[PDB]
């Protein structure tokens, strides 16, 4: 009975073990826990995530540092034929002598595990080459990632201001950012690819010495400032190239010309740079849009205020959405989350069909454990997005200060909102599930015919108005000619966005009734997932069963029995409940690519065709076909190719399952036998006097809804982790 | 039994010599 944990107080002298856990998970909840002021808080998240950027460079440093002395590079830049790159040297005393067996991989000596991250085709893809020429990485990044901490402190120290009110501007900042930051952050990149990298790519080197003496051309920046740009794009590259060594090189930066190549897919050398350039006006033109003292531009209210498009004469306000998104900091961290969430997948769904790297897909592995760590996350976000915009409504938010006002009304006219959401799911439910059992009752029954199977019309459609010059077909005004574009032609859509069907890597894969289902079952996910998040959110405030559900809103998990019987009805436990469908969409979706890809590589595609139009088969050939390789890899007949993976994959099935306790157990039963099990010690010799300092208890009644989860999840996410890899690697594909 | 400030000493010392030479070895007898 002493005093400890240095921030909270109720927690601080709690005699049990909760003392501990609950310490290590209130830490990051600054807004309202003992130590806090709107001045403290802000800054107490500011020199926090200056403790950020900081940890991202001790990551990246080492990424470039288990690479430069071993982990092939003055290899894989001799020609990157699909045989086993390298991350770092695996070193565990538990290893048998089958240290010698693959695991120990060709070129390098002691065992290793190879880059499935992309890095290896972008530390390369912006030039960066020679193994005497290379061994920087940490050296910079780290003589960086320390500065990252220095402000941390410097700006933590009172004196040379850490700044307090100055944290609620906007205009100034974001009038700064989406110019200063992004724009010049682009530009400056536009800078680099072009002076040092494009030359390093098609052309030749750049010597650490000269930087003036090197000149993409003979007669310099020539005109350029002479508004005359055009004659960049003429004989830029070629195709009879031999990538990296000139000869069919040519040297005129920028283009949109030439296109694909059996020797590298990947966006052309230049284009990723006029682009990086090209956008870099717009944001700079964008930056400089709001005030910042001088007296031009804009005040970020007065163009909301009575702005409003369909408002005007439809009795529906717009009051200080600014001093509520600004006075909120949660609205903030969840318009932040999403955008990022929506774009984390736009990143990672565009990063295929348009990978921008020197050998990538036509690698087809790294390409398939990289769409998904960007599909996981991304899903993983979205949730958190939807989860800090059901905290705004409780800790912050202010009914008297927002009302008639369009954030309200959103609350007010809410019962419909979840319903016309739930009506989507229930429909999107049984209608996907008629089509997929029916499709599985009919096979098995002997009749492959009778199979219900809708073509994905409005899909392929989008693409016969693009480049999917698949087996002709007019379309009324288009035909495949007469009118083509007329207004467009030999500019713009040249060889590019002209991959067509390309059974290998055409960008667009040629869609049928197999895809008119998964595509309706990724749609039944973000819908259901969000009726619960929308709902979760749309009353962390309260409702009929719990009316006054607040002053704490979020995680108050549980309530007394009676009323009807009340439970996981905190907006957290709906978040809690949400995260299962974000873990079931972000699976149907990923699941899908791969089966597709797999088949669309070292073999067929008919496979996904008549064998994804049903369900059993999704389990049989895929799931059951294509694990093969891995599991007979501990085999009664010695450790073969993979062993990390399969043991992971059962580590995968345990961490999972062992979720369930947490999940079907519920503190009551646990605590009570610990009541009998803490009559032991006390009553047994050679283990008496011997005092705990924390009172044996069973986990909190929210805590274990988490832990089963934060458990359900790794298992699950650590199983596909090891599943796909452990089978996109073998193949066959 | 001079315990008067110690243990930090025996956890660099003892545990840098149950692990310094304890891992290293002049000619493997490998994993």
């Amino acid at each position: 009975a002493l005093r400890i944990p240095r921030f909270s107080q109720g927690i601080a002298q709690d005699p049990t073990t909760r003392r501990i856990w609950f310490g290590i998970a209130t830490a990051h909840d600054f807004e309202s826990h003992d130590d806090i002021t709107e001045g403290r808080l802000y800054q107490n998240i500011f020199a926090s995530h200056f403790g950020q950027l900081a940890i991202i460079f001790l990551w990246t440093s080492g990424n470039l540092f288990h690479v430069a002395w071993q982990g092939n590079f003055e290899a894989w830049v001799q020609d990157p034929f699909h045989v086993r790159p390298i991350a770092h040297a695996i070193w565990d005393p538990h290893f048998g002598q089958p240290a010698v067996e693959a695991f120990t991989r060709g070129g390098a000596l002691g065992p290793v595990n190879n880059a499935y991250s992309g890095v290896y085709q972008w530390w390369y893809t912006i030039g960066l080459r020679t193994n005497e020429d290379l061994y920087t990485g940490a050296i910079f990044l780290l003589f960086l990632s320390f500065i990252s901490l220095l402000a941390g402190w410097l700006h933590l120290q009172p004196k040379w201001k850490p700044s307090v009110s100055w944290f609620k501007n906007a205009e100034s900042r974001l009038n700064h950012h989406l110019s200063g930051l992004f724009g010049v952050s682009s530009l400056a990149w536009a800078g680099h690819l072009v002076h040092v990298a494009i030359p390093g790519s098609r052309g030749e080197y750049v010597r650490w010495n000269n930087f003036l003496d090197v000149l993409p051309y003979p007669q310099g920046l020539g005109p350029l400032l002479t508004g005359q740009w055009n004659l960049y794009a003429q004989n830029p590259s070629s195709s009879n190239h031999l990538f990296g060594t000139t000869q069919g090189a040519g040297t005129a930066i920028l283009t949109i010309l030439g296109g694909f190549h059996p020797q590298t897919q990947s966006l052309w050398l230049t284009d990723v740079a006029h682009h990086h350039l090209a956008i870099a006006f717009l944001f700079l033109i964008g930056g400089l849009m709001y005030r910042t003292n001088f007296g031009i531009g804009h005040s970020i209210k007065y163009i909301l205020e009575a702005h409003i498009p369909p408002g005007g004469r439809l009795g529906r306000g717009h009051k200080g959405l600014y001093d509520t998104i600004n006075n909120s900091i949660h609205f903030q961290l969840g318009l932040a989350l999403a955008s990022l969430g929506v774009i984390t997948s736009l990143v990672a769904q565009h990063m295929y069909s348009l990978p921008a790297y020197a050998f990538i897909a036509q690698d087809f592995t790294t390409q398939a454990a990289l769409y998904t760590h960007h599909q996981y996350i991304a899903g993983f976000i979205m949730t958190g997005a939807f989860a800090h915009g059901p905290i705004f409504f409780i800790r912050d938010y202010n009914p008297e200060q927002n009302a008639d006002n369009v954030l309200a009304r959103m609350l007010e006219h809410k019962e419909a909102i979840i319903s016309h959401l739930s009506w989507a799911s229930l429909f999107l439910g049984f209608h996907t599930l008629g089509l997929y059992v029916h499709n599985d009752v009919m096979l098995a029954f002997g009749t492959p015919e009778k199979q219900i199977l809708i073509e994905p019309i409005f899909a392929q459609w989008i693409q016969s108005a693009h480049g999917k010059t698949t087996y002709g077909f007019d379309i009324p005004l288009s035909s495949t000619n007469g009118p083509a574009l007329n207004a467009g032609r030999n500019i713009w859509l040249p060889g590019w966005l002209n991959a067509i069907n390309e059974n290998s890597n055409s960008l667009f894969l040629t869609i049928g009734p197999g895809d008119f289902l998964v595509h309706h079952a990724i749609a039944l996910g973000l819908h259901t997932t969000t009726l619960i998040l929308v709902k979760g959110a749309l009353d962390a405030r309260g409702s009929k069963l719990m009316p006054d559900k607040k002053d704490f809103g979020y995680s108050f998990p549980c309530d007394g029995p009676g009323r009807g019987g009340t439970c996981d009805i905190s907006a957290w436990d709906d978040f809690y409940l949400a995260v299962f469908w974000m873990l079931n969409t972000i699976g149907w979706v990923t699941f899908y690519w791969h089966w597709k890809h797999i088949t669309l590589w070292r073999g067929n595609v008919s496979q996904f065709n008549e064998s994804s139009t049903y369900l059993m088969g999704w389990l049989r050939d895929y799931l059951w076909l294509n694990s093969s390789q891995l599991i007979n890899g501990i085999t009664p007949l010695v450790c073969n190719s993979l062993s990390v993976w399969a043991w992971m994959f059962l580590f995968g099935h345990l961490v999972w399952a062992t979720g369930f306790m947490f999940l079907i157990s519920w503190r009551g039963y646990w605590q009570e036998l610990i009541e009998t099990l803490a009559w032991a010690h006390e009553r047994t010799p050679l283990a008496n006097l011997i005092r705990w300092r924390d009172k044996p208890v069973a986990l909190s009644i929210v805590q274990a809804r988490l832990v089963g989860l934060v458990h359900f999840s790794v298992g699950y996410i650590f199983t596909y982790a090891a599943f796909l890899i452990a089978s996109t690697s073998g193949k066959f594909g | 039994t001079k315990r008067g400030l110690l243990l930090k000493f025996l956890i660099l010392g003892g545990g840098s010599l149950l692990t310094y030479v304890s891992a290293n070895a002049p000619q493997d007898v490998l994993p």
């Binding site: 400890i4 | 891992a23 290293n24 070895a25 002049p26 000619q27």
Partner: peptide, 30 residues
């Protein structure tokens, strides 16, 4: 001497832990 770079798994994955499991038993007391 020949073949000897094995200390940055115990000092880390072993001894660094000793420190903090000891040390951080500062949560209990100091």
């Amino acid at each position: 001497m020949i073949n000897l770079p094995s200390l940055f798994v115990p000092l880390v994955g072993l001894l660094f832990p000793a420190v903090a499991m000891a040390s951080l038993f500062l949560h209990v007391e100091k």
